[PDB]
Amino acid sequence: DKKFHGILDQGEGVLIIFDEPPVDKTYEAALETIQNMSKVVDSLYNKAKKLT
Amino acid sequence: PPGGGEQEPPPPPAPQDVEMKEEAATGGGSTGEADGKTAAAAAEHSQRELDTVTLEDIKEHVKQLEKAVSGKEPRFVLRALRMLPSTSRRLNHYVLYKAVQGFFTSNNATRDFLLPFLEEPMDTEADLQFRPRTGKAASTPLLPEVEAYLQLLVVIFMMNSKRYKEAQKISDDLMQKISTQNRRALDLVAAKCYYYHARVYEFLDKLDVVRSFLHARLRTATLRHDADGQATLLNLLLRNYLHYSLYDQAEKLVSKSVFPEQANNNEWARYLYYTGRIKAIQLEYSEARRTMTNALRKAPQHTAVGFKQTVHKLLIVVELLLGEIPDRLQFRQPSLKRSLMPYFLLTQAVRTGNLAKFNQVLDQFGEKFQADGTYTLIIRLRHNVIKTGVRMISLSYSRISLADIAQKLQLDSPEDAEFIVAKAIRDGVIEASINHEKGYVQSKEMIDIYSTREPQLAFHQRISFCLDIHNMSVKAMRFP
Amino acid sequence: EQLPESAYMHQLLGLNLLFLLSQNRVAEFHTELERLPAKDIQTNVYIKHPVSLEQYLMEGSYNKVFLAKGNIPAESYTFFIDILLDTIRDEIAGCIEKAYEKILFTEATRILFFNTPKKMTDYAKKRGWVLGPNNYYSFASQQQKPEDTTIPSTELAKQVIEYARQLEMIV
Amino acid sequence: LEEGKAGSGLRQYYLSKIEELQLIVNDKSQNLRRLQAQRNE
Amino acid sequence: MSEKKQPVDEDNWDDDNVEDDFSNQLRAELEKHGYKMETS
Amino acid sequence: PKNPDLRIAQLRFLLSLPEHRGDAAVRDELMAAVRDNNMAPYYEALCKSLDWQIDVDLLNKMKKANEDELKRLDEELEDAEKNLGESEIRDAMMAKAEYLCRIGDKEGALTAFRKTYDKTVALGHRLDIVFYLLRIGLFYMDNDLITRNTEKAKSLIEEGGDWDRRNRLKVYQGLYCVAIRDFKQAAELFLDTVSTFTSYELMDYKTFVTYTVYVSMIALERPDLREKVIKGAEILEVLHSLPAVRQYLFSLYECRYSVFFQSLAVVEQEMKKDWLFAPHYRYYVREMRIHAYSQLLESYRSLTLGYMAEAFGVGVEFIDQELSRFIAAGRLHCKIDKVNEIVETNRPDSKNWQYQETIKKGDLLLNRVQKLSRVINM
Amino acid sequence: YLASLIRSVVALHNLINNKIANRDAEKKEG
Amino acid sequence: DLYSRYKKLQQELEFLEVQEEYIKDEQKNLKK
């Protein structure tokens, strides 16, 4: 459910909690390259029109 | 007979229109371009000359035969004649032969008749100004004539054409030499002609002495006059020197220079292909991978035809020896696919960690590798297959037994299990620490240094490349 | 190229090839066989031993070569396989560590051959490294323990110096 | 003359190589003078 | 061009690498996945 | 006026790939060929299928009767164009003109489309023309012209707002996203679910249930997976209709690893026969594997493969090489101890994978702009 | 990455608009 | 004749040589 973070053990009967919350800094770059796709794709139309 | 009889007349006048005005507007335009501007060169009709040679080389070439337009070979090589004010009457004579061919049947004179014909620019006495116009009017029938490939008695006329061209070359070296400008239009022709030299010599005998002549020309270009010529001469050298052992490898280091500026465009990149195979023989891939990749990205737009595909055949070789290879069907071409099927199964079994899978491909598909001469990789690639298997098993298993790992990789014995890992550690393949008691092999995952060193090294290439894009954009932007 | 066939033409390339391999020349090896690539594979066993030796040198061998070093035709390769011997034996010592935790006594004695040679005593000097009872050790530790702490921070600042210079060259 | 008529070929080559080099430097000066015309605009 | 050397002689590709991995390995597979059940 | 031709595309894909079906697949195709007088579509299939014997006069009198039916409308327009009106003529010819090109090839359609685009003053018939481009885009599997008119129709639709055609387009982009490989966008555009119900261009609705449920098991996370099926009322009944499809969902939430081989078995047999899944099915096979392995390895920090034999029945080396190849692919990193029969987890992937997507996409993007940069000039 | 992102855009507008304004403007004059 | 022009063609070399300093300095002050 992601409402709780950690890891268990069946043999030793040990639950361990670990957390590294922030995801923001990658979202920064990921959501960029994803749109820059359509950026370059949009440049191919002009580059194709000037040449032929 | 009536149908074909009426279909014979229409074709011949189609060239007799275009091919008549083609080198008259291009050669006759470059005639006034050669008197002045002459900057650089440019001589934009030299680029137009590339387009025209390639124009006939598809349709219609010269001849044949055809028993119609075969009279153009003596026509354009006649009547210089002689000085420019006297050339007006001759330009009209070219048109009088159109009514001669329209009234009566056209006369065909070729083969043995070409010996006095090629000597008629020397009989007219003379052109007399433009050696490249006479070299073009003599070569333009000769260059597509090689497409006959009759090999009997007209190849010695190609030797006579190299002799007549050497006469025009003595006239090329002696005349001018100060703001020559005929040399820069002739270096394209000395290029093409020397490639036709090697073309004709491939069908009879390799040229040992013509390389003495070629190297005389080569070294004699520097420093007196070299524009675009020596870049082509070095590729002439490399072309048969790559096929003919040996030493030619380190020959390039003493030739360079570079030689700048890179010309003509893609013509330099293919040079990087030749030296890419060469530098591959020294087993250095980092220098080889960039020269191979540059060759393909620097060559637009094709067609034609298969050599742009072959340069890609050898492109991924060095990457296969690297150990890191992209899937090659993204460059898949309908004409290329059918050619590399055996090769594609090769790389397919190379990326796998099974050694027997790899040894089967050499047995079945080695017959194709004999023709490519690509066996040089097949001995050294095994090292990369074993390194790939051990890399996989290294990251994919925390702790691995050395005795039990040999059965999967068909390593066959316990002793070499220690050897692969020994050199793996020696080359930095795996950081795992190994204990020999039984023995066993344990591995550990270390990180966090990671993005410190690797991205900054990439950034050094990224940013420098981006500012180079900025400089190349400013350069072409400031011209208006 | 038209000459009477020489009975020695085969192995006379392998004498210089095996000597060249004793000099450790990687680029000249492959360009040596560039004259006849398909012929060296199909025939000339005298050349098929050095190329199998190269195959075994990427393994490496070590032991497989020790099995092939018993049987060689050869000929005249005796003088070359002694040099090949020493140039392999020092590589046992170089390539065993780094990095192995430990190796038992008689286990290394199986590779050094002989019985109780003085070569392993000379290795107890040259390596150093450690000599332990009935065993051996890579201490300490694995070795020299690179961190590298503040040493790379100097070149980490230094790289950014000229990097900023490239930013100023734009500008 | 050999001193000479053909040695003055190198000699006057210095004229043509200086004019070619200077044609590059003059192209670099022309495209840069467009800057000054524009900045003065 | 055609000058000089050449007259002498998402997409689905990224996943098609993995498909190439499936081509030479473990077939697809249905039958073997169903045959491994009754073996043990 | 589409499904009779769409199922023909179904039967052409059913005939093309398997060479083992020589009976029931040709019979239904000829059953639909003797009707509607499909002419050009069966030539490409005549080269692959048998050449008979005789077609000839049987289909020649039908194509001549189709040309008499063609020329009677072509003879109705110039008597109709003598009189005049608004669209009453040009719209009378186009519908039967696109049906007349439904008989064969792309020609009469492609001329009729650019013809009628300058006629209609509303989006009603425009988007209908677009739907014709989409159905033909499925027949000839040509994705070139279907990405364009759709982009142009979304702007005229949302100026603006719609119900039926909007929820229709929601399914269309799902069919294109499933034709190529897009898992997240397909399920996202499939959110309308039962709101489109049964439609001719949407073919069978019962099969739409299955198509929309097959995408939800990948790009939809488990909380959200049950969020769609349990909380969504409209989708709850249709799954209750088919016990085989429902089995896979509730077994996936039940985590039972014995059924996944049997359930994915059926899913894989249906994946083969159905079209557009041939390229993409082999990725799905391993997709569901790693999706089960996720919830599996996340529960216990230390696990043994001998325990996995109980759930898998019985994997020993099978899952050995299996999991090894999942690890080598950077898919769900886990450290397994060989010959000691121990598996370790970890993996705190939020460190390296967080930063790894940046380099993976960055290299490809910039290598693209390198080519475009060297294109200009020369 | 943002650097290289806009670097290509600068080269985009500059090279596209200039090469058009170069050859297409010169062809009408001569 | 030959040596005359030989000494005639480095003049514009040096003239444009100081022209480089000219253009380079002037644009820098013109920016201010």
Concatenated DSSP letters of B339-363: HHHHHHHHHHHHHSS-HHHHHHHHH
- Closest-CA residue of B relative to F343 is B398
Helices (H) and strands (E) in chain D, counts: 1, 0
F342-344 and F335-337: which strand pairing?
Answer: antiparallel
Task: Calculate helix-pair angle for H11-31, D7-40, nearest 10 degrees.
Answer: 20
Residue E26 is given by DSSP the state S
Spatial CB neighbours of A22, under 8 Å, sequence gap ≥ 6: none
B444 phi/psi in degrees, rounded to 5: -135, 150
Mutate to test the interface with A, among F305, F341, F365, F373 (most CBs of A within 10 A): F365
Between CA A24 and CA F321, with CA B447 as vertex, the angle to 5 degrees is: 100
Tell me whether residues B54 and E17 touch, CB distance under 8 A: no
Q: Is the CB of F373 inside 8 Å of chain B's CB atoms?
A: yes
Tell me whether residues F314 and E40 touch, CB distance under 8 A: yes
Spatial CB neighbours of F261, under 8 Å, sequence gap ≥ 6: E33, E34, E37, F312
Q: Is the CB of H10 inside 8 Å of chain D's CB atoms?
A: yes
- Closest-CA residue of F relative to G4 is F366
Q: Is the CB of B368 inside 8 Å of chain E's CB atoms?
A: no
Q: Is the CB of B479 inside 8 Å of chain G's CB atoms?
A: yes
**How many Cβ atoms from other residues are within 10 Å of residue C69's Cβ?**
16
C-alpha to C-alpha distance for F286 and F265, rounded to whole angstroms: 13
Q: Are F335 and F294 in contact (CB under 8 A)?
A: no
Per the structure block, which two tokens stand in for B100?
């001669």
Q: Are B245 and C35 in contact (CB under 8 A)?
A: yes
A44 phi/psi in degrees, rounded to 5: -60, -25
Spatial CB neighbours of B312, under 8 Å, sequence gap ≥ 6: B296, B331, B336
C-alpha to C-alpha distance for A15 and A2, rounded to whole angstroms: 15
Under DSSP, is residue F52 helix (H, G, I), strand (E, B) or coil? coil
C-alpha to C-alpha distance for B317 and E9, rounded to whole angstroms: 19
C-alpha to C-alpha distance for H20 and H26, rounded to whole angstroms: 10
F335-337 and B440-442: which strand pairing?
Answer: unpaired
Per the structure block, which two tokens stand in for F207?
């099969």
C-alpha to C-alpha distance for F219 and F225, rounded to whole angstroms: 9
Between the CA of residue E20 and those of B60, B349, E15, what are the distances in Å?
46, 10, 9
C-alpha to C-alpha distance for E31 and E39, rounded to whole angstroms: 13
Mutate to test the interface with F, among B329, B351, B398 (most CBs of F within 10 A): B398
Helices (H) and strands (E) in chain H, counts: 2, 0
**B144 sits in which H/E element:** helix B131-145
Given G1, G15, G16, which is nearest F362 (Cβ)?
G1
Q: Can you give the resolution of this entry in Å?
A: 3.8
Tell me whether residues A40 and F369 touch, CB distance under 8 A: yes
**How many Cβ atoms from other residues are within 10 Å of residue F276's Cβ?**
16
Under DSSP, is residue F123 helix (H, G, I), strand (E, B) or coil? helix
Q: Are B364 and B335 in contact (CB under 8 A)?
A: no
F344 phi/psi in degrees, rounded to 5: -125, 145
C-alpha to C-alpha distance for B187 and B210, rounded to whole angstroms: 17
Per the structure block, which two tokens stand in for F152?
């142009």
B456 phi/psi in degrees, rounded to 5: -70, -35
List chain B residues with CB under 8 Å of E2. 54, 57, 303-304
**How many Cβ atoms from other residues are within 10 Å of residue B383's Cβ?**
20
Tell me whether residues B266 and E1 touch, CB distance under 8 A: yes
Q: How many CA atoms lie within 13 A of C63 on its CB side?
A: 11
Candidates B434, B409, B439; CA nearest to B421 is: B434
C-alpha to C-alpha distance for F142 and F134, rounded to whole angstroms: 9
Per the structure block, which two tokens stand in for A28?
């920064």
Spatial CB neighbours of B150, under 8 Å, sequence gap ≥ 6: none
List chain G residues with CB under 8 Å of B472. 11
Q: Is the CB of B383 inside 8 Å of chain C's CB atoms?
A: yes
Q: Are F170 and F195 in contact (CB under 8 A)?
A: no
Under DSSP, is residue F295 helix (H, G, I), strand (E, B) or coil? helix
3-state secondary structure string across B448-469: CCHHHHHHHHHHHHHHHHHHHH
Residues D19-27: contacts with CB under 8 Å, at least 24 apart: D19/B179, D19/H9, D20/B40, D22/H12, D22/H13, D22/H16, D23/B39, D23/B40, D25/H16, D25/H20, D26/H16
**F336 sits in which H/E element:** strand F335-337
Under DSSP, is residue C153 helix (H, G, I), strand (E, B) or coil? helix
Tell me whether residues B352 and E24 touch, CB distance under 8 A: yes
Burial label for B345, CB within 10 Å (0-12, 13-18, 19+), is middle
Burial label for B46, CB within 10 Å (0-12, 13-18, 19+), is buried
Q: Are H30 and D36 in contact (CB under 8 A)?
A: yes
- Contact flag for B and D (3+ C-beta pairs < 8 Å): yes
Burial label for E19, CB within 10 Å (0-12, 13-18, 19+), is middle
C-alpha to C-alpha distance for F289 and D14, rounded to whole angstroms: 75
Residues D20-24: contacts with CB under 8 Å, at least 24 apart: D20/B40, D22/H12, D22/H13, D22/H16, D23/B39, D23/B40
Under DSSP, is residue F155 helix (H, G, I), strand (E, B) or coil? helix
B440-442 and B399-400: which strand pairing?
Answer: antiparallel
Q: Are B392 and F321 in contact (CB under 8 A)?
A: no
Under DSSP, is residue E22 helix (H, G, I), strand (E, B) or coil? helix
The stretches of F217-340 forming alpha helices (DSSP H) are: 222-229, 234-241, 243-254, 259-273, 281-297, 305-312, 318-328
- Closest-CA residue of F relative to A5 is F298
Between the CA of residue F220 and those of F183, F213, F225, F250, what are the distances in Å?
9, 10, 5, 15
C-alpha to C-alpha distance for B165 and B154, rounded to whole angstroms: 16
C-alpha to C-alpha distance for B40 and B36, rounded to whole angstroms: 10
Spatial CB neighbours of B391, under 8 Å, sequence gap ≥ 6: B323, B429, B430
Q: Is the CB of B102 inside 8 Å of chain C's CB atoms?
A: no
- Closest-CA residue of F relative to G9 is F369
C-alpha to C-alpha distance for F53 and F32, rounded to whole angstroms: 19
Per the structure block, which two tokens stand in for B92?
């009209």
Under DSSP, is residue B78 helix (H, G, I), strand (E, B) or coil? coil
Residues 228-287 in B contacting C (C-alpha not used; CB under 8 Å): 245-246, 249, 281-283
- Whether omega for the bond prior to residue C127 falls within 30 degrees of 0, making it cis, is no
- Closest-CA residue of G relative to F359 is G1
Q: Are F333 and F296 in contact (CB under 8 A)?
A: no
C-alpha to C-alpha distance for D22 and D11, rounded to whole angstroms: 17
Q: Is the CB of E34 inside 8 Å of chain F's CB atoms?
A: yes
Residue B12 is given by DSSP the state T
Phi-psi region of G28 (alpha: psi -120 to 50; beta: other; left: phi over 0): alpha
Between CA F271 and CA F279, with CA F274 as vertex, the angle to 5 degrees is: 65
Q: Is the CB of H7 inside 8 Å of chain D's CB atoms?
A: no
Between CA B330 and CA B341, with CA B336 as vertex, the angle to 5 degrees is: 90
F286-302 burial, b at 16+ Cβ within 10 Å, e below that, comes to: bbbbbbbbeebbeebbb
Which residues of G fall below an 8 Å CB-CB distance to A? 1-2, 5, 8-9, 12, 16, 19-20
Q: CA of A40 to nearest chain F CA: how many angstroms apart?
A: 7
Per the structure block, which two tokens stand in for A32?
């960029």
Under DSSP, is residue F34 helix (H, G, I), strand (E, B) or coil? coil
C-alpha to C-alpha distance for F269 and E30, rounded to whole angstroms: 8
C-alpha to C-alpha distance for B98 and B449, rounded to whole angstroms: 81
C-alpha to C-alpha distance for F196 and F203, rounded to whole angstroms: 11
C-alpha to C-alpha distance for C37 and C56, rounded to whole angstroms: 19
Q: Is the CB of A41 inside 8 Å of chain F's CB atoms?
A: no
Mutate to test the interface with E, among F257, F272, F283 (most CBs of E within 10 A): F283
F138-154 burial, b at 16+ Cβ within 10 Å, e below that, comes to: beeeeeebbeebbeebe
Sign of CA dihedral B240, B246, B252, B255: negative
Given B392, B397, B447, which is nearest F336 (Cβ)?
B397
Locate the DSSP E strands across chain C: none
Q: How many CA atoms lie within 13 A of B130 on its CB side?
A: 24
Residue that has been written with the tokens 């364009």 in this structure: F148
Sign of CA dihedral C163, C165, C166, C168: positive
**B433 sits in which H/E element:** strand B433-435
Identify any residues that bridge with F302 across adjacent strands, giving them in sequence order.
F344
C-alpha to C-alpha distance for B230 and B218, rounded to whole angstroms: 6
C-alpha to C-alpha distance for B230 and B188, rounded to whole angstroms: 10
C-alpha to C-alpha distance for B286 and H8, rounded to whole angstroms: 50
Q: Are B362 and B378 in contact (CB under 8 A)?
A: yes
Neighbouring subunits of F (3+ Cβ pairs under 8 A)? A, B, E, G
Sign of CA dihedral F331, F333, F339, F341: negative
Fill in the amino acid letter for F5: D
- Closest-CA residue of A relative to G22 is A50
Burial label for B217, CB within 10 Å (0-12, 13-18, 19+), is middle
Largest CA distance in chain A: 71
Length of chain H: 32
Q: Are B184 and B40 in contact (CB under 8 A)?
A: yes
**How many Cβ atoms from other residues are within 10 Å of residue B33's Cβ?**
20
C-alpha to C-alpha distance for B376 and B168, rounded to whole angstroms: 43
Phi-psi region of H10 (alpha: psi -120 to 50; beta: other; left: phi over 0): alpha
Q: Are B328 and B316 in contact (CB under 8 A)?
A: yes
Under DSSP, is residue F258 helix (H, G, I), strand (E, B) or coil? coil
Q: Are F291 and F264 in contact (CB under 8 A)?
A: no
C-alpha to C-alpha distance for A36 and A32, rounded to whole angstroms: 6
- Contact flag for E and G (3+ C-beta pairs < 8 Å): no
C-alpha to C-alpha distance for B228 and F80, rounded to whole angstroms: 71
Under DSSP, is residue F261 helix (H, G, I), strand (E, B) or coil? helix
Q: Are D8 and H2 in contact (CB under 8 A)?
A: yes
Residue B106 is given by DSSP the state P
Task: Calculate helix-pair angle for F57-80, F90-102, nearest 10 degrees.
Answer: 170
**How many Cβ atoms from other residues are within 10 Å of residue B439's Cβ?**
19
List chain F residues with CB under 8 Å of G19. 376-377
Neighbouring subunits of A (3+ Cβ pairs under 8 A)? F, G
Fill in the amino acid letter for B454: E
Q: Are B63 and B110 in contact (CB under 8 A)?
A: yes
- Contact flag for F and E (3+ C-beta pairs < 8 Å): yes
Q: Are B315 and B284 in contact (CB under 8 A)?
A: no
C-alpha to C-alpha distance for F206 and F199, rounded to whole angstroms: 11
Residue C34 is given by DSSP the state G
- How far apart are the two ends of chain C, measured CA to CA in Å? 62
Q: Is the CB of G17 inside 8 Å of chain B's CB atoms?
A: no
Identify any residues that bridge with B399 across adjacent strands, giving them in sequence order.
B442, F337
Q: Are F165 and F127 in contact (CB under 8 A)?
A: yes
Per the structure block, which two tokens stand in for C57?
């040198």
